[PDB]
Amino acid sequence: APQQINDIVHRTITPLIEQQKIPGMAVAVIYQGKPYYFTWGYADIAKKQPVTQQTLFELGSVSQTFTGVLGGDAIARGEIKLSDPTTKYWPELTAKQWNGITLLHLATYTAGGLPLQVPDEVKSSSDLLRFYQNWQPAWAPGTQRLYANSSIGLFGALAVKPSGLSFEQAMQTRVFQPLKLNHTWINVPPAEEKNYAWGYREGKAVHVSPGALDAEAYGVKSTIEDMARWVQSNLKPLDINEKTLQQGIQLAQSRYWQTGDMYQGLGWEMLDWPVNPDSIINGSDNKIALAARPVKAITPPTPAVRASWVHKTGATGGFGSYVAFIPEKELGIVMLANKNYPNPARVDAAWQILNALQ
Secondary structure, eight states, rough: OOHHHHOOOOHHHHHHHHHHHEEEEEEEEEEEEEEEEEEEEEETTTTTEEEOOBBEOOOOGGGHHHHHHHHHHHHHHTTTTTTGGGGTTTTTTGGGTTTTOHEEEHHHTTTSOOSSSSTTTSSHHHHHHHHHOOOSSOOOOSSSOOHHHHHHHHHHHHHHHTSSEEEEEEEIIIIIITTTOOOOOOOSSGGGGGGGGOOTTEEEOOOOOTTTTTHHHHOOOHHHHHHHHHHHHHHOOOGOHHHHHHHHHHHTSSSSETTTTEEEEOOEEESSSSSSSHHHHSOOOOOSOOOOEEEEEEEEEOOSSSSEEEEEEEEEEEEEEEEEEEGGGGGEEEEEESSSOHHHHHHHHHHHHHHTTT
């Protein structure tokens, strides 16, 4: 591995692991289109299993980048349109507050303040219908962005309805297989459990619990190798053979709304490059303050901009993940850890590393 990459990665990540007390971590840097891997610590403390390039980590919200691309692929196939009303794909949603709420609003968190989480008491499909039917928006659609798993989650479920496939089968067949993400799962099979890291929360080993729309909002578990491959696909969609998938990746990176220095895509969020860490943090999902932010529509959406810092942060109770890439520099990074540590620290480390390799 080029010593420059070796040095900046280790000199940045070692202090990070030390300061955040992270049990295990895997990092991939994509430089000029090739991946370089790094791992530290334990996937399982009690059983002393080390983190390897084959260890599976829960991606949490980073899963939404896959959901966003899968929806983009569905648009490309002519199965759905972002301008179509939510009720076109769920006619049972008759409550009037849904008038005017489109698939675009669901995918981009601008439906009017859908909740951060679907409540635990929501199990069945009838329970889910009840939940959305009873929800009362605080705002008109397309006026404010409020990050929400119940918004992108619903988008994922509806986007695959025309296909006739379950969300997982659609994801496997249309995204994972074509890109050869052969160790990426929504449900980890028994044969792969030996590689599934435990997450750690307050010192206790934990895995994400089942919940409504979990597959769509936070259900992916993946290895550092598959995630590096996911970043390469997103860096260079033109290299992808499947037409609708190539188009779908491009649609997920288009800029639909702007708030401050940030642009909202489908799953991915973007800022113009160059930009410093403080601005990225202020213009993004920060685990800390949950913010309602007014948005300006980009009419029509700007196609993916090469000079962008494209990223997504994610977490589950015991895992913290971060992905960021800059298309015009063919540069990217993935950081997977089995501890949910502060987002600002993730952005600071990713920026320190990618800034150094410009």
